[PDB]
Amino acid sequence: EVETFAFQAEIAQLMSLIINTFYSNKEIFLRELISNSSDALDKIRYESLTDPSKLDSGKELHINLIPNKQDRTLTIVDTGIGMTKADLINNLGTIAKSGTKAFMEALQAGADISMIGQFGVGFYSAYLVAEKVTVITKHNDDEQYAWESSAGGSFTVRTDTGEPMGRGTKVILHLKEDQTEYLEERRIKEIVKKHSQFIGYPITLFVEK
Ligand SMILES: CC1(C)C(=O)Nc2ccc(Br)cc21
């Protein structure tokens, strides 16, 4: 059972700008997704300070980066607070309508795409490098769901029958053919060191056979 939704017009416009604008500094997508994971880990940590049972779904707070050259995917896994189905539908827990408005005003006022995270819509920078994005998520108060979009104005949501997650979010980037450098270990390491050196959770870069 798969539900198909239209993006709000402003979000579809944001996605088309990210996909169509000539902009060489694509590597910032990874900083933005790691920052989002850190924010989600902060949220479950704060909740756990007054209710330790919030971590019954997993005590470890971490970020894993998993490249797969055979599938041409880069997956960012975190054990943060996760998202409910309602969160997924509501622009993956963001205030994307107002954030997009502020971002596009900044772009015509000097700013560049790399500042996207300052407007709360950094997730969508995934489309700098991915032709399709799948988001698997599990929040303590809901079931496990899969969100997916190849842009083009729509996204899908379905209950996820895949591997149970416990709690958190997996962002699966199905990379564009010409963006496979982001599967190479030395390139990922360079980006993490350059942009994510102060993230307060362990970031483990998995290696491949
Ligand atoms: C914003 C979004 C979708 C992301 O890009 N990464 C991540 C991690 C945890 C949660 Br909850 C939500 C997210």
Which residue has a Cα nearest atom 11 of ligand 1? 82
Hey, what's the torsion of the CAs at 98, 155, 80, 121, to 10 degrees? -30
Q: Rounded to whole angstroms, how far apart are CA atoms 58 and 48?
A: 11
Burial of 16 (C-beta count, 10 Å sphere; 0-12/13-18/19+): middle
The C-alpha atoms of residue 69 and residue 154 are separated, in whole angstroms, by: 27
Rg of the chain over CA atoms, in angstroms? 16
Span from the CA of 165 to the centroid of ligand 1 (angstroms): 14
Cα-to-centroid distance, 92 and ligand 1 (Å): 7
CA 175 to chain centre: 14
How many Å lie between the centroid of ligand 1 and the Cα of residue 52?
22
Resolution (A): 1.5
Q: Which domains does the chain have, with CATH numbers?
A: 3-205 (3.30.565.10)
At 140, phi and psi to the nearest 5? Answer: -55, -30
Helix axes 185-195, 28-50, angle to 10 degrees: 60
Concatenated DSSP letters for the chain? --EEEEPPHHHHHHHHHHHHS--S-TTHHHHHHHHHHHHHHHHHHHHHHH-GGGGTT-----EEEEEETTTTEEEEEE-S----HHHHHTGGGS-HHHHHHHHHHHHTTT--GGGGGGGT-GGGGGGGTEEEEEEEEE-TTS--EEEEE-STTEEEEEE--SS--SSEEEEEEEE-GGGGGGGSHHHHHHHHHHH-TT-SS-EEE----
* H, E, C per residue of 124-140: HHHHHCEEEEEEEEECC
Task: Please name the residue whose Cα sits nearest to atom 13 of ligand 1.
Answer: 36
75 vs 80: CA distance, rounded Å: 15
- State both tokens at 138: 């599990």
Contacts of 163 (CB under 8 A, 6+ apart): none
Structure tokens that stand for 160 in this block: 């996820």
Handedness of CA 111, 173, 91, 80 (dihedral sign): negative
Distance (angstroms) between ligand 1 centre and the Cα of 178 equals 25
* Residues contacting ligand 1 via CB (< 6 Å): 33, 36-37, 40, 78, 80-83, 92-93, 123, 135, 169, 171
Cα–Cα distance measured from residue 158 to residue 147, given in angstroms and rounded to the nearest whole number: 7
Q: Is the CB of residue 152 less than 8 Å from the CB of residue 158? A: no
Q: Count CB neighbours of 204 within 10 A.
A: 12
Taking the CA of residue 32 as reference, the ligand 1 atom at the shortest distance is 5
Ligand 1, pocket-test mutation among 29, 39, 125, 140, most atoms within 8 A of CB: 39
